[PDB]
Structure 1
Amino acid sequence: TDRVSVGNLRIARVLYDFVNNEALPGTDIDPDSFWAGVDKVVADLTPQNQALLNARDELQAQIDKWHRRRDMDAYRQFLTEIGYLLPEPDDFTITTSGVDAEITTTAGPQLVVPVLNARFALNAANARWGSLYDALYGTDVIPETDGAEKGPTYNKVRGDKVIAYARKFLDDSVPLSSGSFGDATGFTVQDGQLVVALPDKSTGLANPGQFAGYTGAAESPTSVLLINHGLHIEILIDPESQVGTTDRAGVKDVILESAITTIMDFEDSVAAVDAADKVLGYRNWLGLNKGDLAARVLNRDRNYTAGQFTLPGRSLMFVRNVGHLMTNDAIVDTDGSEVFEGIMDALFTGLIAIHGLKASGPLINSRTGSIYIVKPKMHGPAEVAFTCELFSRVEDVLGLPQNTMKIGIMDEERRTTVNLKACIKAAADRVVFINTGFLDRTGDEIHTSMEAGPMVRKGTMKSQPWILAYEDHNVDAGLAAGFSGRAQVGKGMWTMTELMADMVETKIAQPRAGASTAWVPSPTAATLHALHYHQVDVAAVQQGLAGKRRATIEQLLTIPLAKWAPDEIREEVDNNCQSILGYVVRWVDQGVGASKVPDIHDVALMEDRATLRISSQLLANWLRHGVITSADVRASLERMAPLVDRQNVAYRPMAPNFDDSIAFLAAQELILSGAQQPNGYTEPILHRRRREFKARAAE
């Protein structure tokens, strides 16, 4: 067989060769003891890994039959009875140490990209610094009304509104003692503080401490760096430029620190179903931790006059492993059982990250000596304990000190939401953030209460009582554990990549709730979301909330049951079957784990496996209570399958041959058998069908 024999494992050759030729050299770990640890850890941990998965199926099975009989008094008592709801520990504080300042202190956007896409990943690590002019001019933040519409050449009417918008931002972030940046006619620093020239007057910063440094001669600085809320603002002064020649202070651009941290993703935004897929990922992740990823390059750090100092130039990177559910046949055991993909990610992504700790690739990742892993889709504290013990064992195999691997706990399952304090206590010496995964969180809420009744519509979940408590309950728990100045309190993702006007308008709510950070789709959306953290003082908002328990158990357990006309239904099912179809074609046919599919209302939504978990779970729920039928679902399936194809070279249509499309027939499975996946997860059906398409295409 092609696989390579090591203890009780048969490792696919391509993985085995990658780890030996690319990963291990540099880490001073002997390739034979490394594989010995791998075989040993896997054999050690697979049992209670599988035990925990059975506990999900068991706890769930109790809930399902409960609702086909049975109103929160009996319910809450029954959940704590069966071990779902567990006791709350005593108040405590996290002890995680040696964490980069990006996570303990700075507040600001958090970006997520698929790690299998290298040029995206390059742009994301490069996204710690972003032009504000390009994000304002490039999007709908400036309305494309009047004579300010983007064209094939640069539009100057639009250009000055960019400048005026940024001039205002400068006024509301770094105030002058008297006057406005819009009437600014010169910049210079004389005797250590910057003097801004005005028409008649000359004024300085109201707080002269927000001056951080500059480029060029202090006479005619090529730029001036400013700080506010720990976030850096660079004004590039070069009147040579096209934009510089027009601006009344020679200003070329306004650059904001944008992507403070990025999350390189191995889970819901990627398709990776055999050992060849994971190694493109792993190779990209290795390319980043070395600092030699190219397609062009990672950018270097930036230097300033204060003498000279220097700032980070790339976004500090996390990785997101997969959770505890899926297996992957990149490794099989002697009788053929696929090995748990969560354990593989920890060993392999961990080993790789030793390179992002040294320079001999040239570029360092963590300056405090930590490795940052996000663990999605945990179900309770005991699942957190296991991830901890798993990381502790990987550390031994890899020879690094205990607790180098830190956790990014994802509050995206119901059983961790109501036991959140127990969860963070479990990781208490490794946690570096908690984050409301509200899409994954919504799919669990539906699948957990599937037998309770018909669910409210998808749009309506945004305002349901459970969700609102869930968002405030997380911030409560974080601050009560010491997260301020220690660990990020993080919130969820803006999916609408073309509505930056609405994003700039409404996403301010998240930092106003005390979020240290929130998730972004793009380097551009990251820059705009950064405007929100110059407005709101996240650190001050956090202190106004400590103690304030604005949420109880009963608000978290309120199930979004409904109580609709035959227009509101046919519009929901069609809407759903369209975003399911449009995501799954690119998923099954091309191994693309994230795509922008316009919903029914011509809104470009960025989909992943969480959003598809909500959609398919939803129809699934409406089918189980007879809101609609199987043939009605099939109708909307066939109704829209022509539409995504015109909405979509080297691509495969779906209509009229619905039987002969593994992508179409997968989407149909995802709904019609939707209810029977463990916790409504979508990896099984997607992984079996992705591998199927490959198998046909190889014949």
Structure 2
Amino acid sequence: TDRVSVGNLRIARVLYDFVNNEALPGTDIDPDSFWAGVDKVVADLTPQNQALLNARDELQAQIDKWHRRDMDAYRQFLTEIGYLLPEPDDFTITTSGVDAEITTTAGPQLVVPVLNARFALNAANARWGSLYDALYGTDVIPETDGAEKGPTYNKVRGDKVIAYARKFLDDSVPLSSGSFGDATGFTVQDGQLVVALPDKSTGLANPGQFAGYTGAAESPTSVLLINHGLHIEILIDPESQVGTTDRAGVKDVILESAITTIMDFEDSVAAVDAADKVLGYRNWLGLNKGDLAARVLNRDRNYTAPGGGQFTLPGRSLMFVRNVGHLMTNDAIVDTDGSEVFEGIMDALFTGLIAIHGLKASDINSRTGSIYIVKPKMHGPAEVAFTCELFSRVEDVLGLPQNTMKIGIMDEERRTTVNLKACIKAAADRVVFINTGFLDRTGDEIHTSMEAGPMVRKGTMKSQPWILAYEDHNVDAGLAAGFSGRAQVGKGMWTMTELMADMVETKIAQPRAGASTAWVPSPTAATLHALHYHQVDVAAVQQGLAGKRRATIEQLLTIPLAKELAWAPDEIREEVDNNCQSILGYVVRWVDQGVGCSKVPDIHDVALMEDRATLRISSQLLANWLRHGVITSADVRASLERMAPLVDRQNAYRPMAPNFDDSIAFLAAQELILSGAQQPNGYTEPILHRRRREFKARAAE
């Protein structure tokens, strides 16, 4: 074959070559020492990795049985089987060497598929974004009569955008008197910002909110402000299209938006072989070396301090990289017998190696010397400790200081939720955040209690007792662990990519809940969500929550079982079509085109961002309804065949209809539902990877 032998490993040549020719040069790490290290790490930790997976199956088998055969009894049971462990002693995390974007700044956290270079670059550059563009291009500014979007600039709509932003400025950086709506000009005098009004001139209520400016102080090209640690930059140009119409010549209002971004190797991308992993690793490498070009990465921004000195602000989002979890293997590397090597282990080694470049001036990501890795789908403290040991072994192989590789803990599996304190403690010196990945968490909620009975509709999950308890519990544990000022307390994604007016009105609940960050689907969403952090003083919210215990173990364990006679025929029908539509729209692009993240309109025609987690939920819900007689196999088939044609319509695309059984993608969709109950913890990768590889094979012959 086309593999390279290194000890007990046989590395796909493309991966081998990529590492030696692109990743290693510049790290001082000799190839022979690196590969020997890979071999050693895989050999040493694989047994423990498998053991952990066996533990998951064992626990789930006991739970399935318990249901097939009272909160006090259930809780007692979970304790006996080691599912629910004792609460560890109180403690404070000790993670050091973390950048300000994580320890101090509260703001949006963007996620992007790392296999898409364009997206990745746009996301990295999302650190700064036009509020005008975000307001004008979305429904935040309703397209009422006269204010709708046309092929050319609508002056009326533009005026609404201007007023919207002027109000934002008034609410964020208050003037001593008057409002920005009446400003006529901006000047810097005695290191002070002076806003000219018609009747008089005024300074800032809090002069300290003035952070800088560009151009001559006597007539700045831009004025930099700061609120709750986030920058706001007013651009000034009386000659610009918008400026010519503004009272103070204001051209735009730029907001520091995506403070941090997660370059994702997991749920938003489809990488089933060495070739796919390499495309991802190379983009990750380009990001860290700063030379990725599809467009390029922006340079840092230069300003003059109010006092006179020159300073620079990062023009890029501080990058995290989300490795895959402990489950999957990938043939990018196989042993002598041909057994695939655990993908998570490889990601730690490769993304870690690559991350070293982001620790040096491009020919910088982290100035404090840390590598930020999000580790998803972990189940319990032992799996967290396993990840920490993996990182410890990789640092050794890479010759990096111990604890360089920090971990962003996803709280997205039930066994981690109910043992969250312990999970944090296991990574007390490496954790940089905990985040409530509500989608995966909901998927795990359904699978864990699969045998308990029919679950409530998917949409109903967002407001169930278990998830609300889960959200507050995550915050409580993080704050109790001393996260405020040391690590991020984050919350989930807003998947309705086009409903920005709704996101702006409701996503404010997250920072209000003490979350120093939350996930956004795009640069536009990051800029709009940034608004929330200007309205909410997260640092103050967290201080006020410190010490509070708002969720009981009972609330966390409250299974989302549906009540008797809960739905009507039309309601069950809608739920099935909606879930099938979501599954088919996502899967067809996954299997046929290798796209792990797509915008798929639901039964209500609302554009929803689909990823493996949204898929895990839809497939698990239907698997659960089919499992308990709520719907028949005919209902599932009919929905799939009814929605399939619509998906073909919405879309190098290969139609699934009319001959659905000839479509590998259609078959995958059907398999995910019908075999959903048998998938490990309801994970979609096993099926998705197999079907995607099958497609590639067929396409090759």
TM-score under structure 2 length normalisation: 0.99
**Structure 2 residue aligned with 1:431:** 431
Q: 1:468, 1:219 → 2: CA distance?
A: 53
**What does residue 507 of structure 1 align with?**
507
Question: Over residues 461-486 of structure 1, what are the superposed CA-to-partner deviations in whole Å (9 max), with x where a residue is unaligned?
Answer: 11110010000000000000000000
Summarize deviations over 1:497-541 as a string: whole Å, max 9, x none. Answer: 110000000000000000000000000000000000000000000
Whole-angstrom distance in 2 between the partners of 1:627 and 1:241? 61
What are the superposed Cα offsets for residues 577-636 of structure 1, whole Å, 9 maximum, x if unpaired? 100000000000000000000000010000000000000000100011111111110011
Distance 2:501 2:345 in 1: 42
Kindly state the Cα deviation for residue 146 of structure 1 after the two structures are TM-superposed: 1.0
What secondary structure, in the 3-state scheme, does the structure 1 residue paired with 2:212 have?
strand
SS at match of 2:435: strand
- What is the match of residue 241 of structure 1? 240
C-alpha distance in 2 between matches for 1:176 and 1:389: 52
Q: CA deviation at 1:659?
A: 1.1
Deviation of residue 288 (structure 1)? 0.3
Quote the Cα distance in structure 2 between the aligned partners of 1:354 and 1:640: 46
How many Å apart are 1:642 and its aligned residue?
0.6
Distance in 2, matches of 1:132 and 1:687, equals 40
Per-residue displacement from partner, 1:283-316 (whole Å, max 9, x unpaired)? 0000000000011110001111111111111000
Secondary structure at the residue paired with 1:281?
helix
Query: 1:463 and 1:274 mapped to 2: Cα distance?
Result: 38
CA distance in 2, matches of 1:319, 1:202: 48
Any residues of structure 2 matched to 1:612-631 within 5 Å, and which? 612-631=615-634
> What SS is found at the alignment partner of 1:216?
strand
How far apart in 2 are the matches of 1:191 and 1:29? 52
Counterparts of 1:366 and 1:73, CA distance in 2: 48
Deviations along 1:209-240, whole A, 9 cap, x unmatched? Answer: 10001001000000000000000000011111
Q: Which runs of 5+ in 1 are unaligned?
A: none
| Secondary structure in 2 matching 1:441 | helix
Q: With the length of structure 1 as denominator, give the TM-score of the two structures.
A: 0.99
- Residues 539-588 of structure 1 deviation map (CA, whole Å, 9 limit, x = unaligned): 00001111110011000000000111111111110111100000000000
Shift of 1:2: 1.2
For 1:284 and 1:485, the matched residues in 2 are separated by 31
Distance in 1 separating the partners of 2:582 and 2:123: 25
Distance in 2 separating the partners of 1:581 and 1:393: 41
For residue 299 of structure 1, give the secondary structure of its aligned residue in structure 2. Answer: coil
Q: Secondary structure at the match of 2:600?
A: strand
Partner of 1:346: 348
Equivalent residue number for residue 389 of structure 2 = 389
What SS does the corresponding residue of 1:495 show, helix, strand or coil? coil
Deviations 1:168-205 (Å, cap 9, x if unpaired)? 00000000011010000011011110111000111110
**Residue 647 of structure 1: how far off its partner (Å):** 1.1
> How many angstroms does 1:152 deviate by?
0.3
Structure 2 counterpart SS, 1:451: helix
Offset from partner CA, 1:108-136 (integer Å, 9 cap, x none): 00000000000000000000000000000
1:657: Cα distance to partner?
A: 0.6
Structure 2 gap segments, 5+ residues each: none
Q: Determine the C-alpha separation between the residues in 2 that align with 1:686 and 1:73.
A: 39
Deviations 1:337-363 (A, max 9, x none): 000000000000000011111126xxx
What CA distance in whole angstroms lies between the structure 2 residues aligned with 1:297 and 1:679?
A: 40
Runs of at least 4 residues off by over 3 Å? none
Distance 1:614 1:359 in 2: 42
Pairwise CA distance, 1:10: 0.5
For 2:404, the equivalent position in structure 1 comes to 404
Q: Distance in 1 between matches of 2:583 and 2:526?
A: 27
Please give the alpha-carbon distance, in whole angstroms, between the structure 2 residues aligned to 1:429 and 1:349: 20
Residue 280 of structure 1, CA deviation: 0.4
Other-structure match for 2:555: 555
Offset of residue 281 of structure 1:
0.2
2-side partners of 1:484 and 1:228: how far apart? 18
Residue 115 of structure 2: SS of its match in structure 1? coil
Partners of 2:616 and 2:649 lie apart in 1 by 25
Q: How much has 1:429 moved relative to structure 2? A: 0.0
Query: What's the CA shift for 1:459?
Result: 1.1
What are the Cα deviations for residues 316-345 of structure 1, in whole angstroms up to 9, with x where unaligned? 000000000000001000011000000000
The residue matched to 1:254 in structure 2 has which SS? strand
Name the CA distance, whole Å, in 2 between partners of 1:86 and 1:145: 55
CA-based RMSD of the aligned residues comes to: 0.6
Aligned residue for 1:659, secondary structure, equals helix
CA distance in 2, matches of 1:239, 1:271: 47
Measured against aligned partners, the alpha-carbon deviations of 1:60-111 in whole angstroms (never above 9, x if no partner) come to 00000100x5511110000010000000111100000010000000000000
- What is the CA-CA distance between 1:420 and the residue it aligns to? 0.1
1:635-654 CA-partner distances (Å, limit 9, x unpaired) = 11101111111111x21101
Correspondence 1:658 to 2:660: yes
> 1:549 and 1:490 mapped to 2: Cα distance?
18
Structure 2 Cα separation of the partners of residues 545 and 194 of structure 1: 35
Between the aligned partners of 2:645 and 2:541, the Cα distance in structure 1 is: 49
CA distance in 2, matches of 1:179, 1:2: 72
Q: Give SS of 2:642's match.
A: helix
Instruction: Pick the aligned partner of 2:574 from 567, 571, 576.
Output: 571
Q: Secondary structure of 2:59's partner?
A: helix
Q: Residue in 2 aligned with 1:647? A: 650
1:343 and 1:683 mapped to 2: Cα distance?
16
Q: Secondary structure at the match of 1:318?
A: strand
Inter-partner Cα distance in structure 2 for 1:647 and 1:42: 44
Matching residue within 308, 311, 322 for 1:309: 311
The one of 325, 328, 332 equivalent to 1:326 is 328
Matched residues in 2 for 1:246 and 1:3: separation?
A: 64
**Residue deviations 1:27-76, cap 9 Å, x none?**
01110011000001000000010000000000000000100x55111100
**Secondary structure in 2 matching 1:601:** coil
How far apart are the structure 1 equivalents of 2:224 and 2:660? 58
> Number of residue pairs matched?
694
Deviation track 1:126-175 (CA, whole Å, cap 9, x = no partner) reads 00000000000010000001100010000000000000000000000000
Looking at structure 2, the residues matched to 23 and 9 of structure 1 have their Cα atoms a distance apart, in angstroms, of 19
The alpha-carbon deviation at position 16 of structure 1 amounts to 0.4
Q: Distance in 2 between matches of 1:144 and 1:577?
A: 32
Distance 1:470 1:484 in 2: 19
Distance 1:85 1:467 in 2: 17
Supply the distance in 1 between the matched residues of 2:145 and 2:531 (Cα, whole angstroms): 25
Q: Distance in 2 between matches of 1:235 and 1:570?
A: 51
2:612 match: 609
Report SS of the residue matched to 1:374: strand
Match of 2:169 in 1: 170
CA distance in structure 1 between the partners assigned to 2:635 and 2:284 by the alignment: 44
Deviation, 1:424, is 0.2
Q: Residue 482 of structure 1: SS of its match in structure 2? A: coil
Secondary structure of the equivalent of 1:354? Answer: helix
Q: How many Å apart are 1:266 and its aligned residue?
A: 0.2
